[PDB]
Design a protein around this ligand. Structure first.
Ligand code: E0V
Ligand code: E0V
Lengths: 493, 493, 493, 493
């Protein structure tokens, strides 16, 4: 029985836990539908940028939270039943006990604070009393996912059935510079995505998920990556049904304290993996890895794991941080699927700890935007120079992010940055260099669609690097990729 | 237990009922989330404009359809359990019988054909093998609403509780030219709405519903009308919680065969209420009235009933068609709430059968757009001339529709039609005349937000008359109304 | 010596000619730059839509009007020196006499009234006290063009020199179904243009002219048509320098009283060439033909004459109206260049008087917009059916107009009318049928850029059929044509 | 006699002066209209971003350059006649000599290089082989202005006449904290402008000038500033006719080497007024001051001089640089008009050398954008704190720049940066603080309209801080200012 609906809702002030609001029904309360991120569902900056706790509550009568972002505190008649740290993976509690009679009071308290102990991690200032994300997307929070009571081929799916669980048969493993599904040389076509819609924020959107898949099949794409967090269970099963290759990724974005900017302790900047003042996320990072792999163990669409997005991988302490997490990933994946991490700009093949730990090299490069733009010729020289050097490893290289901010509507015959023409030229140059090297095994544009971020001078009402707008309407670049991807097969490219 | 999820889906070809698809599991099937309109969830004109039947199916293990648009045909292991005509109101069936063991096959067949027998009615051509709506919104179909197994004051709501059902205490009745809630002279502030979002089509959107309410409270609005169909049960309860005045309306739009255009039988145009060739919707019209009132009997937000939107009310046979439906409305409303109908342009106080049957006169006037535009001065003369004549009845007059198509982004200091400036000037002129007459008891703009329609030369990617865009972003007119409505109280204006 | 600058300016009230304003300096006067259309240079609908006369004036000290739209009345110290009817071709007067001493008073009175006696002709209502154009562009008026005192190959121009006059050598003549320049089979690539910029209105814009040419060479175009009026002398010489093929056209648009709509005399609609109540433009039509050809006699870019745009050519009296004008065109063109007229939708090869008089058949067809849209398949059947029938004449057929209104920014993966995707699909279908017939010798899209029109429900802030916006920014269709035209040569296609 | 037209044109390669192109007619030449900036009149980044010299040429038969940006080199039959450094003020040469017979060859060579010796000054990198402007507008170059051969009250102009020269009588002088025109306390209402249109670049646009004035009178504005360079003579006379208060400004923008960024000599950053490595513009700065004041000596609209825009005025050497230029300004202004300079963010009353030299304090502050955004509350605290401190001087304070980048079309009910709502809120906060202090004597928004800049991550297709778009269409903020300025008089506020 799904508990999804409009619940009672109130923000803490913060004299909430003192007055024991989880015992009595909330007075002067608001309304809020679940599942949904609450940030965009009321008006006013003080509500959207609220710092602290919120109180959901709903009656019951006669429990698995699919996701609660970030920190959940479940109650019943006042007695705490659960606690959970981790805003993008499910958790459940037993309720045979503590469920009195009929008319009972279920309260869910949700916290949004992010720091060096959370995944994603929150910095102390802007990346590009308040939360300051160390990541480039908005800190949507609340009960994002529902609360309920209780040969396979890319683009050519076939799932047998087996509680009933669907399953698809497929082999995936890496040989040299080749990514093989069912022993055939695959090429990744697609994007890095976001669970981002209006006004749901990060709340699950089954209609948009299907529309996203239809658009991808319209665009002749085959893959995407769950940047920068594991998606909903329903979206994963859909890729199983629809035959969409997925790269599952953990909530480990922002373990890199070189943005912006930086953080100082004693008049000196601190490194990322400083044991005393740096990140305190390791033991939670593996908790997320073992919780993720336990969830999507059997999804034939899951093809490769991503331990972290854009970490300080070329810094002191980077190897000793990721080695125990990498090993764990191979330890609990019964299929021994490839594992990787997506690398920031500035990483080279020699300095990246991913050069050894990862089966596949996954790059996030912005030659022609953050680097070199608007000089596409100079940026081409650099992209080729770094890409040649990455071939020294004899591993598959894969671009997981590359893009240019483009506001839909801006045009010029002599293109400039932020126009739709410049975006197509940016991708033309990059794709031209990608086609020169036989060890690249995929292109994944950033982003699939425009998505909301925190406010800054460098973000024009969110991140505009999508091929599509936030309402999924195509920019000119979306028709460019559709034509290019129509001549690039899934296997043998 | 909510059955909402992604189901199996296929379109009929139309050799579907022959091959008995409702018995065996569907081969070569697609995917489709419910609840949602399917029209926008795949790509291609042939899918969006599909004519005929679609087949939903979902397994069961151990039934109330909140809405199925338009015609539902429920199955189980092959045996038909139900049929329902009526795309916007709930229906249920008993399932103690016919539910074998555990693993069973629930199939829902949905038809989209509209004609002179349906509400809404479908014409034979464009209003402004295919369905041609006699109404100005898109023919979204599918399982729009979920399938599940089992003193009050405006803007100041208070609902006692009482199965548990919430209830709010309030008095509503008409005295002379005054609309009184709790014996105080009310003024309607708001819009005509639509259940229209992307990509859900008409599918229920609990996030957008709350965002809509927040925007209305941001804009200092108090009311809206369920144009042109009854909304979801969840949206009605939200207006109860949030204290939003609602005008409940039936699915009776398009009982007017003077659009465009017209229909001919024997070389001669036929009237609307021709008994042989005209509308065949009467007995279904009261079925909808008795089904609607049975659903929202106790919603304190429901304040007035609307029997039909824009009917041929000044034509022969109009009185004898609406008299038995009007009487029924007063017969089954235990509160004796006011009843009305919203009148097309061209109606006068003398010729409208609503002049006698309705407690409140509800007008849809476009002085300054369809009539007179771009001459706002001439259009002002006409609006005053017709409005003065409507005062002869000593009844409350209320504008339920007035607006000008405005594409967000188009501006000029010397305004022209379709720009944001012209839209504000259009509303300034109209509102100026409204303030001259003490018998007008409300203004409701058309529309609240841009919504999808059928394609025509006169529709610029849908209906653009919204104060907000389809993604709820405000046009300049939305800030004009917010300032005007901030100085107009709920009572005593 | 150029008199171009900001002059004194005032609108008549209309007690202007009584008070003899042309004698004394204008009191309570405004400012206005020449050359420019005055309509958009002040604010307010009453100024933009002004009906009647305006008064320019400027001092002199010690005369050829390049164009005065429409009717000019030149003065000096009060004494009338000139009168001119014809808003788009030059006229001059002698000034040795009437020029006293030094400080003198030059007044130019300009009228904007259009009716059945003017070219372009003004109707009595909207086409789709006030001027109501029988043409689809705005009635910009004022001193549009400056007032001053005193082998060639397409895309490969070479002009010898010869008062000094430049000249280019080239042969043009029609053989069968072939348009030959220098005895090679040409193909027209380009558009119908407009002298339309902001805020100049129709005023000459030498910067935009060069930018237009650069954009055409960027788009791999070779031709355009001076729709619907002869352009400036400077623009013609530029096409001589830049090697751009031009189709010179007269001011004869709107000699067709079947728009909208129509005009009635005695309870009955009147035909276009009714001698008593219809058009009274014939003797002025040849005055324009002999004035035009006298101006561009030597422009090597002028390749074909266009007697009228979209006339009632399949109606009674159409042949006897155009025969004396056609003959005149061949009489005064010392090069015997081809002559034609562009035909409205609904014209067939049998009924069009252009089927006999014209050397080249020039069609304005909207299969997929005005006809058939949004059914591109049905519209394709019609375009092929009419195009096949036009081949019966053994003449060259050329499309001078075809397009779909497109507001820059509107997109959908499943296209609908007014989006950028639908515009590309519209042109794809049309161009596919054009490539099936060897007797079509050119495609000219409508329009090159968005331009201002009179206000109506069918015009979304002007005409949006341009491949480019009014500020020359490209829509998606502009890159489609650039790719298609890059593979289509000038000769031998 | 105006030489304005389309000339021969070619870019140097750079073997141009060797081959003596100024002697023979240019082979393989292009076309270019004058007056106009050439940068946007052809296609391709290599043309728009061309570094070096361009060659204009035009025949003559039987000379004052109104502006040539930046460096002019005039020829005739090969013999150099002139040289001029200074891209925004007129210069002339005698031609009785050197003018042979009739058919002669006039060549104008134009250079675009900017460095520490030019005004405006060019840096070595981006401010926010190539020119890198130290200013926030595009380096438009070419023959921008024409080449030719030969009581007053704000908003209530009256000019007597007096070669004939118009003149207007008015008194202007500063008393305490009051700016008085005709001994009445004035308040500046308006903006900082730019000579920026499409596609003319910085080329003179008499139509747009009049449209700009009409829009200002529509918006109830009274003043603007010639940021950041003296405008055309025609625009100045128009403000005389139309009664628009102007603040004339020199070409002295970018004398501040703290942008971005900075420049290093020997591993150390150099100060702005370093005599050896810093700016070398002083003696040219006064040449511009004495050339400017010699031009607009008699314009009654000129009300105050601006010596430089945003200089390093709080740095070592700043006082000794501006003292001789300031004194010169009072030396040659026969009216002893006030003189000032507009100050960068970060300047305080104590450290600004303008605190002593200037009669009026002119600030460029961005509280709520560059500083504090999106925290409008915190930014309000700062604006009040700095504004209170500026009152210690007992002088008039005037804001010459304040604004937020706004892309037309972006909206949200809960505003974020770059939307139209945030722009209105930004101006509401600022204007609220301005109204608290009686010593502020004007508000001038930045900018009047969107204008082109060099490309950077921080510039969304140019500078979007305009109240209007580049095609003069109003954003929502333009209607906010129109309402505010309608209640603020010219005198006595
Ligand atoms: C097959 N079914 C139908 C039914 C009605 C009509 C048509 N087809 S076609 C047409 C029309 N046109 C007038 C304009 N003409 C060109 O079209 C451009 C544009 O419309 O954009 C114009 O800008 C340009 O100046 C013109 O040369 C094209 C024909 N006018 C009116 N008046 C009610 N009705 C119709
Ligand atoms: C308080 N915290 C900070 C931090 C950094 C900066 C500021 N405040 S302020 C500023 C700046 N400005 C330069 C431009 N100047 C005006 O602004 C207009 C515009 O920016 O739109 C311009 O179009 C117009 O021409 C100019 O007169 C305004 C100052 N430049 C740079 N270079 C990295 N940094 C900063």
């Amino acid at each position: 029985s799904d508990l999804s609906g409009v619940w009672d809702f109130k923000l803490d002030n913060g004299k909430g836990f003192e007055e024991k609001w989880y015992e009595k029904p909330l007075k002067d309360a608001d309304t809020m539908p679940v599942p949904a991120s609450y940030n965009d569902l009321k008006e006013g900056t003080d509500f959207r940028d609220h710092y602290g706790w919120v109180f959901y509550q709903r009656n019951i009568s006669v429990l698995r939270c699919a996701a609660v972002t970030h920190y959940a505190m479940i109650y019943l008649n006042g007695k705490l039943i659960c606690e959970h740290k981790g805003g993008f993976l499910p958790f459940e509690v037993e309720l045979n006990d503590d469920l009195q009679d009929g008319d009972n009071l279920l309260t869910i308290a949700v916290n949004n604070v992010i720091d060096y102990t959370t995944l994603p991690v929150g910095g102390k200032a802007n990346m590009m009393p308040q939360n300051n994300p160390n990541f480039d997307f908005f800190n949507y929070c609340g009960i994002t996912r529902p609360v309920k009571i209780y040969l396979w081929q890319p683009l050519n799916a076939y799932l047998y059935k087996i509680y009933t669980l669907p399953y698809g048969v497929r082999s995936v493993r890496v040989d040299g510079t080749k990514f093989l599904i069912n022993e055939k040389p695959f090429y990744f076509k697609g994007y890095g995505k976001h669970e981002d819609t209006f006004p749901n924020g990060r709340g699950i959107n089954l209609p948009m998920n299907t529309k996203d898949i239809s658009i991808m099949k319209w665009q002749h794409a085959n893959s995407f990556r769950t940047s920068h967090y594991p998606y909903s269970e329903e979206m994963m099963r859909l890729c199983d049904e629809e035959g969409i290759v997925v790269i599952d990724e953990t909530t480990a974005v922002g373990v890199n304290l070189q943005f912006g900017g930086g953080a100082n302790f004693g008049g000196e900047r601190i490194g990322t993996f400083d044991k005393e003042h740096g990140v305190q996320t390791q033991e939670h990072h593996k908790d997320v890895i073992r919780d993720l792999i336990s969830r999507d163990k059997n999804h034939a669409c899951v093809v490769m794991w991503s331990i972290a997005n854009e970490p300080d991988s070329a810094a002191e302490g980077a190897y000793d941080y990721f080695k125990p997490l990498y090993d764990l990933a191979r330890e609990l994946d019964p299929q021994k699927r490839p594992c990787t991490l997506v690398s920031v700009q500035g990483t080279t093949a020699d300095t990246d700890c991913s050069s050894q730990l990862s089966d596949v090299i996954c790059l996030n490069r912005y030659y022609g935007w953050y680097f070199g733009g608007p000089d596409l010729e100079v940026s081409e020289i650099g992209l080729r120079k770094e890409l040649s050097d990455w071939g020294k490893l004899g591993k598959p290289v894969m671009f997981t992010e590359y893009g240019a901010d483009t506001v839909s509507g801006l045009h010029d015959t002599t293109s400039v940055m932020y126009t739709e023409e410049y975006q197509v030229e940016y991708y033309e140059m990059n794709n031209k260099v990608f086609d020169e090297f036989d060890f690249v095994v995929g292109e994944q544009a950033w982003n699939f669609a425009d998505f909301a971020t925190s406010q800054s001078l460098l973000r024009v009402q969110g991140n505009k690097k999508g091929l599509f707008t936030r309402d999924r309407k195509p920019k000119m670049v979306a028709h460019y990729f559709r034509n290019r991807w129509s001549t690039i097969p899934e296997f043998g490219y």
